[PDB]
Design a binder for this molecule. Structure first.
Ligand SMILES: CCNC(=O)c1c(OC)cc(-n2cnc3cc(-c4cnn(CCO)c4)ccc32)cc1OC
Ligand SMILES: CCNC(=O)c1c(OC)cc(-n2cnc3cc(-c4cnn(CCO)c4)ccc32)cc1OC
Lengths: 338, 325
């Protein structure tokens, strides 16, 4: 049955940004669009956050540089990984790791709520990510289901540090952050707040979503949701363990100081349940604190300058050279060719 | 829109791909029913495309018909839009045509009769599908037609003209290629002409390596007619696939056409056709009353016409009462 497959509006040719080939929009931002793209050289898949600075005042531009420097600080298996930054007279391109699984919340809609054994595994991965950030003086401030992503193995990757900010222990912050349902009651009231304690509440709403498949606080209008957040009251389904209810009930506490610290959340009885986890305690210990020559030889064969490659890596400028090393390195762990 | 809920469906396998959507087979957890879900990524939609699906969703609400796919529930999340519709076990007609070849005119008529009743039903309701292709023709377990993908469907008032391009190019009437303004029902009819040719011949009436080649082919209005085709069928098609839109048959003339009337007499066909010119089922409500869910809120869901988890379980159970469960 001979036939051709024609495209109604003849679709134009794909855009390319210097070895990247843009596929589809995968995110929308305040001043950005996120597009999935392919690195033509390494065949790897990546996300690219694309920012049009023409429409930006000078303030917005500094906030974006702050975000970029924060991202440079975080190389963590459960934090989205920044591969390279490109800038032109007019555009800023952020090339970050691509998460095949997508939003966790949509994934739950498809497959239902998490059995606590599962929820414990992922939450452990999330906390190692957030603890790593807090230990390095950063707060996400927008920890929501939508910013929690899954790779092909369904491991967490936190993403979109646009609302993230640097902080010193005990500073107060004045600007609002994040999605309202994951917002701690102080943000609604508008008080100044300590950064990590507001993430803890957001991490509380996250845990509830994982085990129950529901939101603790929700409303038809912002005022209604606002009422529900301030009440500090929520449903607990019968299937939840008492240790989990203890954990969540003590994370989602209206008094910011009455909230647990990140250190005892890792020690909480619910976390210790199940088979003992050495790898978890290791990543938590690491938070307080070489020359893959195979890839190096491969890049030289492709004609990339051996000396310049080393200079890009040591200088830590995320450029055309460092990104190909990082990408070929991630491919080399997968045991694929070079 | 309306908020999505975790643990009401279990999505399993891809069954279609669309411009900005994927359709996946899923099972309704409460009723164990099988359903199809079109999943749309809102990040991929500009403001115009967002309104387009809202129009599609509004149009699906208007149609409750045995040969039109039924929309059960609409769900939305931050990034995704969910359309939960009736699942057609037989699948695409296109798939069936690939697997088994052209259809004998006897069966082609059985299917085609079912198709026009749906298309005529839509037209009677001031709706035009505009994308009628073998890929949007589905079969249920009884091998009955179900029309699908009202992505291009649009409302109209008789004698209004429409301006935007629509649908698959092989099934496009020559005026859409030319870019002229057009009467909606007349383009549905050409598109149905191509469908009939596809069913009876297992071939495309118009095709080309490039869109320009194909376009030239449609504009010529000339096509092959096989020797194995009945003289009556050729007449029908030749009068459907007419370059001058006004010169094409009306849907009334299509239903009364000599090819349609061939074979054994059809009371059920003419009945459905008549129905197009111009039922609360309390039995399930007690079954739902048995699930302990609030009768007052369910009735408000049905009157309010908001397609939620209440509407889905009602519509699904209602299908069980037709199934004789
Ligand atoms: C607007 C600001 N956004 C960011 O910073 C940001 C971000 O947060 C909004 C997320 C990503 N991001 C990385 N991989 C992704 C994969 C999906 C996805 C969706 N469906 N699917 C299934 C297809 O297989 C996959 C979606 C987003 C992804 C990148 C970002 O820019 C660095
Ligand atoms: C993106 C636009 N698509 C739509 O509107 C759209 C659509 O487009 C034509 C079709 C369906 N649809 C409903 N039931 C189906 C069953 C099969 C199927 C395939 N194999 N099998 C078993 C035999 O192999 C069954 C395939 C598609 C089905 C749903 C849709 O979303 C409403």
């Amino acid at each position: 049955m001979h036939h051709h497959h024609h495209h109604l509006v003849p679709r134009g040719s794909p855009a390319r940004i210097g070895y990247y080939e843009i596929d589809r929009t995968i995110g929308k931002g305040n001043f950005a669009v996120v597009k999935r793209a392919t690195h033509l050289v390494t065949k790897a898949k990546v996300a690219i956050k694309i920012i049009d600075k023409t429409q930006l005042d000078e303030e917005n531009l500094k906030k974006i540089f702050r975000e970029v420097q924060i991202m440079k600080m975080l190389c963590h298996p459960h934090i989205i990984r920044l591969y390279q930054v490109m800038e032109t007279e007019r555009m800023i391109y952020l090339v970050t790791e691509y998460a095949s699984g997508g939003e966790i919340f949509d994934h739950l809609v498809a497959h239902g709520r998490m059995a606590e054994k599962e929820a414990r595994r992922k939450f452990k991965q999330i906390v190692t990510a957030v603890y790593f950030c807090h230990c390095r003086n950063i707060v996400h401030r927008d920890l929501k289901a939508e910013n929690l992503l899954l790779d092909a193995n369904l491991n967490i990757k936190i993403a979109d540090f646009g609302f993230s900010n640097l902080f010193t222990p005990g500073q107060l912050l004045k600007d609002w952050c994040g999605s309202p349902p994951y917002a701690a009651p102080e943000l609604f009231e508008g008080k100044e707040y300590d950064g990590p304690k507001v993430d803890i509440w957001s991490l509380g709403v996250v845990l509830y979503v994982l085990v129950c498949g529901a939101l603790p606080f929700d409303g038809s209008t912002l005022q209604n949701l606002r009422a529900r957040v301030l009440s500090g009251k929520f449903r607990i389904p019968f299937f939840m363990s008492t240790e989990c209810e203890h954990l969540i009930r003590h994370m989602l506490v209206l008094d910011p100081n009455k909230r647990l610290s990140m250190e005892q959340i890792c020690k909480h009885k619910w976390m210790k349940l199940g088979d003992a986890d050495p790898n978890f305690d290791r990543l938590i210990a690491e938070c307080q604190q070489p020359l893959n020559e195979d890839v190096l030889l491969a890049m030289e064969d492709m004609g990339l300058d051996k000396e310049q490659t080393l200079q890009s890596l040591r200088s830590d400028a995320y450029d055309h050279y460092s990104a190909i090393y990082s990408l070929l390195c991630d491919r080399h762990k997968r045991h694929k060719t070079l």
